[PDB]
Symmetry: C3
Subunit: 432 residues, 3 copies
């Protein structure tokens, strides 16, 4: 059940009904490929064997160094593959690769305890040693062997291609790195809750986009790369999306108008007694009513930040805004409708596909729901609205920009707030 | 005929002679692939059949949810695939896929009227049902069949790969989604003007970059994805590119200087009596003298915005600037030359490849055309200039930063304008 | 030897010990592919020949036009492929392609002098003319020829695929454009120093990411694309990375606090008597202790900018800061530790994997090294620290935010500095 409320007073709208899936941690698995030491049909086999050798050499040469890779400016700075790189660094210690090679001798999956105590799931996805030693060495022939060897070697060649243009670190994790069944069985044998396994298994395409593949080591006929998978430690909490657009006065004299915009737009999810706030567009991914975000791109805020939607002048949280005199027209397409900021001479309308223009917006900030509306036009820009089913509520209220004296209004404030704007107005009213 | 003018007074330059091709709308087509229900040569065929089945399963599991995906901060916010997703949602209604399956029984292209009245062009690009049922079922053999089945199945495997790492939505649209001849014949059978067909057909690589492929439904042996193609409703209007760079005073005492920069840089195209303004770099693509832009990334401005180039103090449009005291050196490579903002101790030169340094810039903002100039250097940064043919005109004029008293100059104004700067100066001159 | 210093007084940290590799120029090579003019086994060959012809046609149609493609806002604007496009433009002049075709008749590599004097290295990587004329024309059969022709043609098909979704300009340069051995031998036959050859050869994956492939011309059975490779004219100079985080007062009354942040974070490298400053995250790539940057994304600053780390009030360089009252909590993961900006009610801790929480941060800006620390948590965000070996030094000092009177503190200054903040404070203290 997705619902939406538009606040006429602040030119903003909140879409709720979403459920969280936040990446809070990382799981590191070690994916291995076992390697071999080494007429027209034999010629094709030798050409494919050369492609095999060059791929090994290319990956060997690849890792002569350590692997590396409105309110967004308030975010901190993480190191996204620090956990995977740390595991990879452990794999270079003496005897470490040999432990993995021994654990996977009689099975393709095994949990191995690394020397520093880290327990990682290991996975041998391709045994090229067995194939080359048992099927190709006796030759050095028929066409079926040529075809089969090309099929088996192709995956190594494609993994190498990906690492070669990504400096050894890829994201999203492709099906060459981990096929769909491999990833599913990895998730299944992963030490996580039943809710997490079901969530990851039903959203593998999102899991791939939030994962990293880190080329790690070639040693003792073992090719190992670390696949860093997301841990969703927050699931099924309420989330809501805040959409904001400029609210300006609408006086006829050009340049005499003042504007404010709520700057706190983005995704919000309840999380551990606080609210995780994701300011940056497209750092969250919506699947139906589930929203996948990454806490690395969030601020942790008091839950009172939500009061800004119902009462922007509330005394418990100082709601953030920016101010200007740039009254240009635009639209913000919401989850269930469209906010329209129409100023000046701009033509602003809403239309249905079958009937055409059904509403002409007057100057100011207004809203239409997606029920019976297919597009909105603001100036020369046509916007298609989202056709998701859900109820919108229009909350009438006097635009708060009307409460300000333009003669003392502080414009060109970007990182401002209700209180900071009051503070500056008081200082200007004092000097006069 | 590309031409350029440099305005010494405002440290800016305008390149004109370009012709518009603006994406104003979207066309949605439905691309279908028909699917089949299901010794060494048979073993290779069974391995390829398993890859076929796993791809179907992977795509089935992929769509258990709804598909989703200086002055730029003034732009609105659209929902780029809202139109395609709406069409995809219609394809899930009962009987809808069956209509497409029936329309394409005896032909690979057909226009189908969907239940909600939407008329979409449909296209069956691959009949794997016919191939597997008529060529592979009788077996369950020779090597040529193995090769042929791998060739036909590969496209399904690659489409699936693309969707798997893009969560079901890809852009640009690859030749696996729509081959070049397929796209060309799609454009040809598209209900659009002759000018649009010629424009799209001669610029298919740009059409691909402005299109989306949306994985939609697998149902009744039909795989359908929606290809959302750009509609160019504005073509062949004049466009011009505005380049700007900081203009600072050049006093010797460090820190005593003041700067302004025109913030209205970007692409401008005449459009329907107004001007479409594209502030963000690389949201427009230039092909010779044709500039492809997307109106979703534009403001719609009065045509008087153009007056800022010839007279930044004009009374009809309030030209936008930012102010600072950060007099750092840089260059802006224009269409036909280079703007050089040289301040402090920076070494700023222009060179020809055969002769070396031909000009040393003094402190201030200056310009050289690309005629006889191959590179400019500002500090430790070497810039190659564009070698496009065209005439430059140097418009001499006193740098407007000289008209300001630094003691009342308001610096650190980002979203400012000529008038707002005058307004603040008047208030500062009043208190004194 | 990577080392790090944390400055408690300014909530910042400098990581040093790195060595530079800066792209300062471009080298343009011309890569060519020689082309041919043109039962179940012959049917597969004819299908592959059609894919060959369509690829040629697609590339012909592709180039009917000219090829094109905190403090970051201070950077200039370059034209990254201006040098390659200029070389490509020369290849269209009459007789130019014929010179390359003649130079490569008896050898696959040759230096050619173009008509405008430009000396380019040329490279024929694939002779499809010889293969089709000598192996396929006599037929118009066996399965080995079908397999071999698919192998040879595949590279042309993949190059075309890359150009088709990139509008003729790709970066990174893939192994289809230039295989690893091809690139290595290109570097080896390149007219550059021994240090550059060793540097490029040991970091080919970075070379690929800093290179462009520009589809140029199909003419006289020759397919030519220009590969624009980086020239590293600055190597082995000291580089250091500056990390910064907000420094706020910690009074209990919400909203009464003031903040400043050093805005000069990014990479710094000594360069030709000045310092190249790279403000933008991830425009530099670190390989062990070598940092690859691009001077196009740099400012050239006086070396005195370094004084801001030891003495932010130094009289020789005016250190840049931003000011606000937005005291939100976050962390910055450094090279060898973590800066923690903890304000309000936020829970801020540091943990070891084996023992859990070992330190709880109090309000203010603080730091922990990565020795014995695996993660830090600030609010709902868990950060893994980098586990690189190296020594950290904690430089104690009074937070400089304590020196400011909040009643006259100018907040919401983004492009500010120590002196500009003093200037504004003096004007506010004068009116009172
Ligand atoms: C990507 O889209 C965006 C574009 C701009 C903003 N944005 C800011 O960051 N600031 C703060 C600020 C004030 C200031 C003063 C001067 Cl003298 C110079 C640089 C200044 N900066 C940073 C500018 C960075 C760039 N370019 C803004 C202040 N007013 C309006 C918009 C602002 C936000 C965006 O995210 C939606
Ligand atoms: Cl979203
Ligand atoms: Cl929707
Ligand atoms: Cl451009
Ligand atoms: Cl050019
Ligand atoms: Cl870095
Ligand atoms: Cl590290």
């Amino acid at each position: 059940n997705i619902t939406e409320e538009f606040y006429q007073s602040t030119c903003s709208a909140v879409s709720k009904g979403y459920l969280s899936a936040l990446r809070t941690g990382w799981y590191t698995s070690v994916i291995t490929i076992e390697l071999s030491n080494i007429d027209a049909k034999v010629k094709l086999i030798k050409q494919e064997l050369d492609k095999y050798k060059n791929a090994v050499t290319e990956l060997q040469l690849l890792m002569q160094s350590t692997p590396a890779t409105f309110l967004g400016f308030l975010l901190g700075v993480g190191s996204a593959i620090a956990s995977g790189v740390a595991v990879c660094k452990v794999l270079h210690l003496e005897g470490e690769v040999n432990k993995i090679k021994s654990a996977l001798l009689s099975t393709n999956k095994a949990v191995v305890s690394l020397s520093n105590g880290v327990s990682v799931l290991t996975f041998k996805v391709l045994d090229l040693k067995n194939y080359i030693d048992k099927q190709l060495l006796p030759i050095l022939s028929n066409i079926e062997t040529v075809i089969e060897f090309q099929q088996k070697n192709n995956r190594l060649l494609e993994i190498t291609r990906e690492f070669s243009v990504n400096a050894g670190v890829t994201t999203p994790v492709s099906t060459y790195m981990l096929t769909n069944s491999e990833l599913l069985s990895l998730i299944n044998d992963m030490p996580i809750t039943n809710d997490q396994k079901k969530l990851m298994s039903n959203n593998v395409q999102i899991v791939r986009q939030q994962s990293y593949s880190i080329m790690c080591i070639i040693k003792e006929e073992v090719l190992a790369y670390v696949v860093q998978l997301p841990l969703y430690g927050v699931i099924d909490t309420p989330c809501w999306k805040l959409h904001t657009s400029p609210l300006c006065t609408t006086n006829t004299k050009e340049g005499s108008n003042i504007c404010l915009t709520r700057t706190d737009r983005g995704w919000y999810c309840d999380n551990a007694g606080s609210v995780s706030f994701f300011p940056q567009a497209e750092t969250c991914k919506v699947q139906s009513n589930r929203v996948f975000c990454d806490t690395m791109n969030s601020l942790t805020l008091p839950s009172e930040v939500n009061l800004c939607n119902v009462d922007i002048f509330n005394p418990k949280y100082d709601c953030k805004i920016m101010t200007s005199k740039t009254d240009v027209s635009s639209s913000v397409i919401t989850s269930l409708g469209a906010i329209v900021s129409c100023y000046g001479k701009t033509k602003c309308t809403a239309s249905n596909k079958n009937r055409g223009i059904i509403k002409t917006f007057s100057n100011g900030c207004d809203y239409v729901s997606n029920k019976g509306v297919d597009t909105v036009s603001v100036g020369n820009t046509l916007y298609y609205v989202n056709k998701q089913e859900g109820k919108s509520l229009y909350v009438k209220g006097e635009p708060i920009i009307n409460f300000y004296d333009p003669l003392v209004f502080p414009s060109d404030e970007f990182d401002a707030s209700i209180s900071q704007v009051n503070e500056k107005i008081n200082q200007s009213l004092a000097f006069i």
